[PDB]
Design an enzyme around this catalytic site. Sequence first.
Site, PDB file in Angstrom:
ATOM      1  N   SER A 170      24.770  59.205  -9.506  1.00 12.22           N
ATOM      2  CA  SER A 170      25.542  57.839 -10.261  1.00 12.22           C
ATOM      3  C   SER A 170      24.741  57.338 -10.221  1.00 12.22           C
ATOM      4  O   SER A 170      25.190  56.181 -11.539  1.00 12.22           O
ATOM      5  CB  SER A 170      26.586  57.907  -8.465  1.00 12.22           C
ATOM      6  OG  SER A 170      25.391  57.061  -7.824  1.00 12.22           O
ATOM      7  N   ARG A 183      21.792  56.749   1.333  1.00  9.60           N
ATOM      8  CA  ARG A 183      23.586  56.009   1.663  1.00  9.60           C
ATOM      9  C   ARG A 183      24.136  57.696   1.089  1.00  9.60           C
ATOM     10  O   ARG A 183      24.085  58.108  -0.113  1.00  9.60           O
ATOM     11  CB  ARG A 183      24.484  55.231   0.712  1.00  9.60           C
ATOM     12  CG  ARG A 183      25.475  54.673   1.027  1.00  9.60           C
ATOM     13  CD  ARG A 183      25.930  53.842  -0.053  1.00  9.60           C
ATOM     14  NE  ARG A 183      25.738  52.556   0.378  1.00  9.60           N
ATOM     15  CZ  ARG A 183      25.586  51.033   0.434  1.00  9.60           C
ATOM     16  NH1 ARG A 183      25.888  51.505  -0.795  1.00  9.60           N
ATOM     17  NH2 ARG A 183      25.231  49.758   0.472  1.00  9.60           N
TER      18      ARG A 183
END
Lengths: 204, 240, 220, 239, 228, 240, 250, 232
Positions: free
Chosen positions: C129, C19
């Site tokens: 992240s 993504r």
Amino acid sequence: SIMSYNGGAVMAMKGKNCVAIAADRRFGIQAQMVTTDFQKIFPMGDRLYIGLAGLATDVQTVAQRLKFRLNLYELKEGRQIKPYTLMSMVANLLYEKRFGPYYTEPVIAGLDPKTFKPFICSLDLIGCPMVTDDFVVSGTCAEQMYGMCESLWEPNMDPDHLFETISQAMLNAVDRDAVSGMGVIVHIIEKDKITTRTLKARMD
Amino acid sequence: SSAGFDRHITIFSPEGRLYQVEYAFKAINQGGLTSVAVRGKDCAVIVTQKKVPDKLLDSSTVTHLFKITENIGCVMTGMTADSRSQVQRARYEAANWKYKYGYEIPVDMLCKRIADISQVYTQNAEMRPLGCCMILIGIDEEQGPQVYKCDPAGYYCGFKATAAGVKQTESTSFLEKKVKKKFDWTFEQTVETAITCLSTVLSIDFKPSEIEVGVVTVENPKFRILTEAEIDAHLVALAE
Amino acid sequence: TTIAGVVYKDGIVLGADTRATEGMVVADKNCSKIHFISPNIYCCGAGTAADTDMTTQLISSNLELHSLSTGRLPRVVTANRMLKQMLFRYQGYIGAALVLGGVDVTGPHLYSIYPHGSTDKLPYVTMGSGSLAAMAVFEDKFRPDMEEEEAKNLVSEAIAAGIFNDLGSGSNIDLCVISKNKLDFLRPYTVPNKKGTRLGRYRCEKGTTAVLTEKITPLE
Amino acid sequence: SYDRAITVFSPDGHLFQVEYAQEAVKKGSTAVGVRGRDIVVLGVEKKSVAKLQDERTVRKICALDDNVCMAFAGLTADARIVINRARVECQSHRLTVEDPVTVEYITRYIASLKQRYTQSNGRRPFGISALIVGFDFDGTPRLYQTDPSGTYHAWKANAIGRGAKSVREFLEKNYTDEAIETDDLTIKLVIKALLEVVQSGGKNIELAVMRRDQSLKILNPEEIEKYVAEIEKEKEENE
Amino acid sequence: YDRGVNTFSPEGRLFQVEYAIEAIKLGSTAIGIQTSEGVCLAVEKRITSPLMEPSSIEKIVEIDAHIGCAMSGLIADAKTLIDKARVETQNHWFTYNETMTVESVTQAVSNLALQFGEEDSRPFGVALLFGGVDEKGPQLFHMDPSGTFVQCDARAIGSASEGAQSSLQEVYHKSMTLKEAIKSSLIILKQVMEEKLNATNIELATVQPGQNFHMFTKEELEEVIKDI
Amino acid sequence: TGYDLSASTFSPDGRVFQVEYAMKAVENSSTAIGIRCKDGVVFGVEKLVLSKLYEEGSNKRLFNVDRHVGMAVAGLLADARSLADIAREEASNFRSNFGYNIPLKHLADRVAMYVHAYTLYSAVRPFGCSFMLGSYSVNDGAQLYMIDPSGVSYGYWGCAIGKARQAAKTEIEKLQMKEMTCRDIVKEVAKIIYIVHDEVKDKAFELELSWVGELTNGRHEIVPKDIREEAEKYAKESLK
Amino acid sequence: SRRYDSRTTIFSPEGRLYQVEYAMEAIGHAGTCLGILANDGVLLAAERRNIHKLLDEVFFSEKIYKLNEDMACSVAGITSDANVLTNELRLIAQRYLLQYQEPIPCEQLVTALCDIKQAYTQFGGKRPFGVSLLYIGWDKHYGFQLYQSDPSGNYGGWKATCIGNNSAAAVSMLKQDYKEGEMTLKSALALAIKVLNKTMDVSKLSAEKVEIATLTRENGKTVIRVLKQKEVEQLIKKHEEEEAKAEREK
Amino acid sequence: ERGYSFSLTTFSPSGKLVQIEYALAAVAGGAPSVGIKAANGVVLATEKKQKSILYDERSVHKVEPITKHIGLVYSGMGPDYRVLVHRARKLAQQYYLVYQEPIPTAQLVQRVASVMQEYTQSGGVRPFGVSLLICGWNEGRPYLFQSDPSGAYFAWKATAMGKNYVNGKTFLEKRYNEDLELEDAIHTAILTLKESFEGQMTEDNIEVGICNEAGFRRLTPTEVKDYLAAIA
């Protein structure tokens, strides 16, 4: 935003055996339009176009800079250029200004020079390529065109439904947008020929 | 067949030669010195004599064996200044290797860089081509020991038991007659053949004070220069 | 973006999620963060994408050059040393969160690189992240010297938990396994998500849009 | 760069390359130029065209400004470089001071470039010799020549190229004030001087004039034919 | 037999500079005379052709409003030196509010009379006579290619300097006057020149403490010549 | 002919005639010797009076490079000053970077590389110098080196540089090194210099002696030569 | 260091430029080209120097280098010396197009290359570019052009050019068969066929040993016709039938 | 380095470049080689004689890869050869940086010929005495490119360079044809190399690398020792 200085929107959409690229026509300083005939889709050889969106300075500068390197490549080698090669060239040219960056988001849409294979990709302002299969967009009104193409796309598309789909997508996503409007130019290309149509968009 | 200035600088003659480097192949010959290297099973042996005619002159500062790195030794012939300058160039690139690439430099890559630099001194016509001959020895993992040589012309190579200096048409004749006949290669087969080949070429049969022996082995990969006592041990060890 | 790495009893299992978010909007549903370095060494990137891309292509070019100059297999520590020297020479401006893995003569070696130039050798790393969720899953279910399918299931589980937690994570899951001899590289490892079929065919018709000016240009 | 001194003094007090680069001028085409009092005129002989090709590219007479005109001899490439640099310099003067560029300024620039060029490290001297004709403010016709040394040197008529001694000897026995009376007569005087020079068939006689308040007009070689015809008529009228 | 440009002699001097001192000899003559009333100066133009316009050849150029000059032989190298000497005197008046005296002018010239080299090209080929009126009264100064700069009271140069220096030493003394020195110079000129002396051959340049700037237009030269 | 010109060219038999011509340039100098003892190094330079020609204290060939190192030059003098300045600069860099006293090997190697680097090209000439380098350290002992015009630098116990070179080392070698303190060696070098180099072409001469070791506590300075005056009272007794 | 300088810049005591003429006599060997400027179109001719049977001919291009869309050039002299010159020339034309976004006019291109050559003829003493080369092209101001470079930096606009030493007699043949611009695009090709049939001593002109490329004027295309071999073959057969018809006058 | 900046390579009064002609003679005095393109791949083959029986044949390598798909051999002097090899190595990786695609062999020969020609003209340096034989399988059709010390280059169906290159060339003209396979290419290559070499030719006297459209491959003395049955 410096990206919201002159507006701009470029859409490319992959069909079945063909690819369609479209953009808006409006040029102006932020709330004041100037002209309706500003060119944002440039020809790079036959059956292969590029679209540029963002600040118009970097648009014309990168287009001329790329045309320079492109003709030097096509004269050093007698063949014409493959689209991955063009993508890597634009990535290298943008990454040469890593800290002096241009403000543009190039969109490449073209066919295969050997087969009839389509190709789409887009880059960021530092040179991040991204190849997909459905569509890539670039400009201020990103989220509108994302909604349109994720709403209306089918995988296997005859050029008529391709043209009408990209037409409806551009018209609706532009009409919700403010700073980008004033007409649509559409390039629908295929293995045999190249078709360019302009749509009756709201001139407001 | 000479034409122009081909006797002076590095250009091409009518026969296709250049004369400066093939004058430099006997720039080694004014040293008056002989060098022998031997590589067998898991050891590698250098032997080279000294020449100290003076009683006022030392013995420590006359060593030609130059420890390049902790796993690389070398020996030099030819004129001394070219040799020592070549040694500092080799050490500087070995430390450059260790800085950029982390692991220890292979002895092959070092000879490649030295050969390329010797070509650079050969390539341009307005820089002098360093008339010294350079012998390298080293240990490689998964290959054992290695023996390499770099020329003034810039052609490195590497081979089993090798010799360069003054008298090595005879030395290479003896090493053809000695290593091709199915000899096994122990630590003392190598040491015995090294001291005896130079001892049969020059026919001196001398003290333990003239030759220096640089060794390396895969039990201690550090380069090692021998002491006079164990040199004496090998010397009376070859006395049948 | 949640990449992970691990060392099992013989080699290295690397993972990724594809993504590519741009800000707050999903810009890609199929990307590739596992990059080529050498026939034995691969690399994963995180953070700024184009920085990782250009840096890893430069280092892969230089190590291909070095390996063809030498005539043998590259070493992982050389890749680590080049990367840390370059990233420290840029003073932390280039953001490239890297996971470096390969099998040398010495064996498997995993390195993680933080974009200033601080490097660590670890048996398992997570970067990105959503790295915290995968590091949680690793510290829960790691044991030294695992087997192959155990490690593959573990890394898939870790990145899957990162996708069911993190917001910048979530796509189909990339894996890569490096041994002394067998290199594998797979596009969809485990596809957790499906998509509902459309409920209305909102297809336009042949002529539903007004056209002002046409052009035709033939070709060969 | 090339750290050497090409041009060395002689053992007897010469510059070999400055005096000797005059020979390349001496073995070039001939060109004359005079000033009348109101109309200026110049032109070249010895074009030596092979009679069957284009002729617009071999033009040895050009201009730098709307005020100044060129001519040269020797080899043509050094003239091409010097003319390009002179165009740049005159236009850069127009950038600053708002006058039309004075001819004396551009001759000083050319001669200064040529001399600091002979002086410098290993630069081969320019084997040309230019003619710089222009008519600056208040209509004053002036003409200067150059030299490979770099000495601008104002004349009233020209003597360069092949056999320049003969041409100056004809101008010597032809220094009549009355020759500079009519403009047509000054043109015919150039034609008669160039007729006292080479074959002068009326083919390699390329001439261009300026009436000092207009620009350069290159003449069509039928007027020059009638000029040569009336010169031959006056030569018959001498008998 | 080409040697390197910067070689001494076996005897001791230098080659190229000696060849420059030879190169002066072909030049045209010039005569300057120091007088307590003011400095006077003269030169010969060496007119070659009647096509050759007479008033364009420069020999006396103007360094400052009170510093004169005259050159010889090679013209164009001298013009570069003249330009730069003017520039440096202007730098002196600007950064000092005052007049750079003639000796300091010529020191600023002969600091690079010999800087000819291959790095950082040839020696210059002109002999210069410098005049003017500084605070030390009138001055006449003579330099050379070799930088050997000296003060001369009445120096003669170039192609006829032997008889000029001799016959100048015949007539010169310390308490001369101006116009006497002017005609005493041009007598020597029309003894050393080759053509008849008339209005177009020579030119004068005189600067006085009273006649403040060097001023010499034509046809006072006619009145000076007809008084011979 | 043609091959004695450049410092870059080789010979038809393989040597540089420039280096040879510079080596026999230093041969014309007077005489500079040196010798070490077990706790120090003693220098000595024969300087000659013609008649007047100077003042007892100009152009002293015993230089002083570092706090514990000095030169003992012979040959072309201005080149020796330039080399001493380069050595002073190098000891300055070493003291500024690593923070301790320069080892004599490194100083000699840097100077030898500079001399060799001036021999490599045609733009520069080789040096016309040959000098001595002595030292002392509590962890290193006494070291005496020697640098030729070519750049070959190694160590001695005793040496001699000048006209009388063998005949100055004929009796260096009749000394011994273990058994001597340097205070004997002062008058030994003194009496031999007065012995060698007879009165024949030059009439008056003059002695300089530099002096380093443990007795100077690691310092290097000229002797108080007037103090103990140890040459002359045995030197006038050395004529029979 | 100065007794090794060859001095390839200094004027000889004869009165010419020594190194320049020897570059020209290097031009004179290994080559023979020409073109025919006659109306609607322009052509180039070229001779195979390496006509050995074991080549590939896989370049799709020979001696010609299509340097832009509307310009190519025939070469003669040292080959890679010119490959360097073609690279720099092409780069000059492309930086011009970068600067103006309008195509490059053929004479400031020729002066750019000529000043490059003059700059290595003039200072320093470097080996001169021993390459003469042709020019074909199109503009907005004259239509069709031909130019002749020289190693000196001198150029000239010709109407039917000459390079090789074998072709001076060809220029004599060009004048003896001079026309006043009649470009039936077959008479000029037959003329060039006749010229290279006569001038080279290669008997009867095998078409593998020759090369002809043309440049015709189309509105949006400006095609360059590097034509194939079969039309050359039937052109030679046409010309030898016309030579048999021409010598029916004896 | 000293600032002289003049080139030794100047035109003859005849108009020749005597140093380049001498460099070509220096190439002609080198070790022979032959390389043949035969419809599917290209075969390169050299002639590698050790001076004594002491030397090892695992240290020096004539056939040298430039990319994963490009081979390169020579006939001349190794000490210049490796330098320009390394230059070609470094050169190909900038192209692969720019375009992220393997460089074509035509582009290699353009850039290497430009470097070599530039090196012929620049100041005070001798030209390389090296004639290359470059090949590779780019875009289906394989290629074969020879260069020379003059900086020029060509394209051959089959050729040879070295000792008795004319004799091997006349054998090539007689032996080769249009269509062959890799094995028949090796057959005629070892035939034309055994035309000029010494009598005892073994698995180490020669050194052979091939090319596939699947990529470059450098053969071993194992398969060389396989092929020396029924030799030439």
